[PDB]
Design a protein around this nucleic acid. Sequence first.
RNA 1: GCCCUGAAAAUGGAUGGCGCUCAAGCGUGUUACCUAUACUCUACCGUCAGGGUUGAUAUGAUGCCCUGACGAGUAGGCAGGCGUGGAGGUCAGUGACGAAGCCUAGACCGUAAGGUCGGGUCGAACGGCCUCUAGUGCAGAUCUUGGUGGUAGUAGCAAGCGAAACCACAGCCAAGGGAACGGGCUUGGCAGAAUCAGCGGGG
RNA 2: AAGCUCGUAUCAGUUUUAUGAAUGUAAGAAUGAAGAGCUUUUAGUGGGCCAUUUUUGGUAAGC
RNA 3: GGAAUACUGCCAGCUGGGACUGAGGACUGCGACGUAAGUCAAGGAUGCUGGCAUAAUGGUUAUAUGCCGCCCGUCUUGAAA
Lengths: 125, 146, 197, 151, 27, 51, 33, 106, 170
Amino acid sequence: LPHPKIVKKHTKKFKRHHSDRYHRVAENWRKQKGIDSVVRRRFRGNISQPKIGYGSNKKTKFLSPSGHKTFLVANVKDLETLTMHTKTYAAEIAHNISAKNRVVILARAKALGIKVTNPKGRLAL
Amino acid sequence: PRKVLQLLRLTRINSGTFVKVTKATLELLKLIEPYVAYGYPSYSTIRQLVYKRGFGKINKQRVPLSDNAIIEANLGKYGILSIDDLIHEIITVGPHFKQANNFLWPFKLSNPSGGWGVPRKFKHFIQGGSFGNREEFINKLVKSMN
Amino acid sequence: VEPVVVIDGKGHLVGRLASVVAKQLLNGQKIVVVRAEELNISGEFFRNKLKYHDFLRKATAFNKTRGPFHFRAPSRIFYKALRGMVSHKTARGKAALERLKVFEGIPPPYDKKKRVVVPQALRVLRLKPGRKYTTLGKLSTSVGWKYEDVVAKLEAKRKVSSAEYYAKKRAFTKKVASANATAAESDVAKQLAALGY
Amino acid sequence: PKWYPSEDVAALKKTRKAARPQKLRASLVPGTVLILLAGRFRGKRVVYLKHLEDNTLLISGPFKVNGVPLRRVNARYVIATSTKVSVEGVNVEKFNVEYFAKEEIKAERVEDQKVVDKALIAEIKKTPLLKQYLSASFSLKNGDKPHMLKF
Amino acid sequence: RQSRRTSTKLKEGIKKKASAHRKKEKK
Amino acid sequence: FFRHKCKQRFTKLTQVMITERRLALREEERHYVGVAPKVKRREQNRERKAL
Amino acid sequence: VLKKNPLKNKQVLLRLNPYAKVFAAEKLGSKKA
Amino acid sequence: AESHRLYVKGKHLSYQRSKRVNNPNVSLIKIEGVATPQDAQFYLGKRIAYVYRASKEVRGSKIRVMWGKVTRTHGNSGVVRATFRNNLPAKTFGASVRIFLYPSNI
Amino acid sequence: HFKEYQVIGRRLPTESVPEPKLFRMRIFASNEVIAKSRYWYFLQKLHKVKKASGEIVSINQINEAHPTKVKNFGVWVRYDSRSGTHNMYKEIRDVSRVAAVETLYQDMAARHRARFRSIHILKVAEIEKTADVKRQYVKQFLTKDLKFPLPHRVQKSTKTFSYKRPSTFY
RNA sequence: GCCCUGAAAAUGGAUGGCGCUCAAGCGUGUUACCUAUACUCUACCGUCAGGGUUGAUAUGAUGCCCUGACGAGUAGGCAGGCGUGGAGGUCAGUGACGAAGCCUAGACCGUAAGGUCGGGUCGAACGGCCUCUAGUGCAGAUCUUGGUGGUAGUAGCAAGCGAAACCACAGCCAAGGGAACGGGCUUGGCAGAAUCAGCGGGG
RNA sequence: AAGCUCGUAUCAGUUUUAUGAAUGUAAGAAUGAAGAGCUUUUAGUGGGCCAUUUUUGGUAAGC
RNA sequence: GGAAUACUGCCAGCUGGGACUGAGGACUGCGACGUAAGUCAAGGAUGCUGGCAUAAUGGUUAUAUGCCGCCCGUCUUGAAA
């Protein structure tokens, strides 16, 4: 696709305050709530908090580096819905689909012209 | 004074407008002295102001000017039909002034190209400041703020 | 420019000199200062001799030994002065006073190699003609430095052994300035001149 | 073109930029001596011959002088020196863009070299030291501040 | 020896001495 | 909508008679092999023992 | 869509005010008395 | 024979900063001999390379590079502003940067 | 920097009082508007008026008559300070009326800390004949054939590193 | 007007440091330059407001657009989502050719809640979607239980054996940090790994 | 937050003129705002300190 | 007596150098130039050329340097405590 140049806005992960100091407090983002907190009051130098401005360009949203939207395919029927959107969606084979089944999803997607985001999954030579 | 600045439409800092000058307003400009830099425009500056920073109120919506028909439509009521017609109504304070002025959306002005001149912005111009009446000099300022 | 700019205090103003010597390391500039002792300053003598001792007293309480060490020897006097305008303490700093070097006298290998000065900082050229102005040498001494002489003496030597040098050179040139003179005025030359050279 | 679009791409708006021919900086008048700033032949003195259709310049050393073939080159990667030669004796109109396709050196290309070069050498031989000037390499020397420098 | 730093309690305890000189003059 | 979207389907489906283009120029000495993780032990823990 | 400004860009300075063609053929800024 | 230099040798001074907050995108360059903003205008928009050896060989050469542009002047001394692709490292504050002569206006 | 401004004002003509007295004064200022502003301030010190009660009739610049000649300038100055105001007179050897009042203002700052708001310039007059010159530092140049040197000449260097070791003859 | 005098002690001491003297000080003037989340302009996000759009639009009119303005926030209010156990429905869903779980100096997405994939371990069941339902989401409670540290091979047993109290985190001075607050900050002095024995020294 | 009338000439921490003993009432005065009023109900809220400007009592002062 | 020239102000005067940006996506509109045909700098970037598959490039982690960053929660009091 002659896609627009995808602007990422904020590439760093939004970690949680103090998720580094304590092993109990986790990297999963949670707002700070104490009114004596500096993070909540966004003093200089302190960690960047997720606000709505970091929101991605609606034209480019969901678009992966390939410039395709990710899409999970379970079986060879589900794949063949994108028969029409090869230029736009990328057949992510789903993680639990076996070896014996995958090799079959790859047969079709190659034939149809669907770019599979995850080939070589379980599969060897 | 804060109330009064709002009544001139001088909301954000570096915003600029025109004012019809009588007894009434010449007492307002007294109140807002420390907050503004007011003076007498040329034909020229207006002309520079209006082609670059000139915008039109239409129901709400700050609309860009850039084609005469717009003013022809919204202000054709008052015998203004071009942009230069508009200018004519500003410079010579015309009979439809209140309308043509009000149709113009209060100018947005970038900080001066060359700086303010002074070190300290908040003294009366007369004693090496910026605020208040700077008469003709205003035209050197606005054109750096254009 | 030049990789090493051996300076030379001899009539500079501890300050100023410094500053610049400073900036220059910060901007990656291998310097080297010489004749520290012939560094100068501003003001009477019986001053710097204060604006110092005071400095001296300083020192630490409970443990005098651990504290503001009062160096005597010129060089250092002036060092300080400078390690005082260079965020010394931080890589980029250390990384400097790394680039520095301040000898009293003018020992090899520098004796043998051109030095220079730093306008923007000579007594002569900054001090309103005729005004009180101190001259390290004394000022060091007056407060510990035990050598003023060695330097001195083991100086005069240098100067000598040099000037001598000089000559030999002055003699040399002359010859050139003479050859060129004569074999000057023949075409070739001429031409040049036209262009300028 | 016969194959109907299997996918829905929207066609472009009708774009409004006509290509206009490139206006070269004043100093470049065919048969000028140049310095090349970048390339295999960076630092060489090189003669200007013809401005091209691809906004480039056709230039030769010439090859018999400094070892620069008939080459195209870009306008900005060159300093124009004031020294001009006679260029009007040269036939240049043979070479255009298409002269420079590739789909061990071609024996056709070397024949055009010597036609140009011998029709050029003559004019360089008139001026003193120019044959020598061209063979040398331009460089900057300590104290050449190139905002001061005249070319 | 004396210092030449103004401690802030003084630097602002000058303003609060200067303010007292303003109200003194009026009366 | 149809009038066109059909022309469209028709095409993409026709330009997928390009399976023959995969299946004539086949003869590929590769073919996908499943790795079962039982095998990926019997053939890993048995070598350590052989050695 | 985009604000072309007169003053620069002649072409827009002809859509606003057709007179400026006439202002430029007579020089008009450069007027002698 | 002695020189192959087709560039002006400047040093990398800092990042444009304040007292407190540096932006590392704008590298400040001193150039050789340039004293004014006027003399600098010449250099505006020429390509800079910062050059350095690294440990490991990459493309048959241990000798890596970064590239970038003089963008505008800075104060009066002729110190100039400069932006690179990847920013210059800070560890290189006070290092030599080769400033080139393409693109010519001359 | 300064310019001289001839200003006249007349307290707007009321009924039965047609065309009043007209007050002419030469004001040194930097611009026409400082000039006007200064003008009313002086009006309030001469008599009872206000800026709204009167009108600036005519404000016109004055250029110096011969600015390739060197005159001597006897200047009367009223100025305020920490104490109550007090009259003064100095002398200035100069080129132009305007550069004179200028160089006076620097001196009035340097010696007496007084700023432009404080100083009234009373009257500036050329002195034609010598011996009317009452100040020594002016009389000092009014001798036949004054030949002197400027010893200890600072040569301002652009480059930080000088190899010559600078000598200051002239 | 500037300058000296115009008294203030007691751990070493501060125009912030260095240092400055036709200044890097004082007064004044002129220009140049430096930089904020301020202002200008462009893009983007979102929200609000105004609208367009059907003998139907080459995408769900609860769509797809067009224009403009706006964006701090505690108590509090309103709204849209993300996640967990179970229920109905559905995907003729996934699954020993390896379900779930667990790791992972691995990849992608989403502002985020989170979601997806590869590699490794693993061994039997599980997931999306539309709705239901609730014992549903943790950093704290001198929380509850369980597990494990430093203290420590120390006190100790009236070469071996072997605790506990305690534990946000570290522990150099000097000055400044307005609030009987200095321990992290600002400006300095400084500072070389590693360890044993004193005082009865301070907190 | 919903409902009803309007969508206006509904007003404004503003100036002016007019009329009385800094300050009252009006405008066929200016400028600004399409965001107003009437129902009905529903959360959170009862901290002071500093500065400014008028005074009032104040003696070494401070206040 | 005769010009100038600075200064202030104007130009819908001309000619350069540098950085940032290229939103949008058939055509409609306002125009300009041309006798017309048409063309255009006119409702937002097009054109040419170069670099690659043992790639190009992009990332992860460990540090380094510059600059910034008081220990989280709760509860008082006007906040710091």
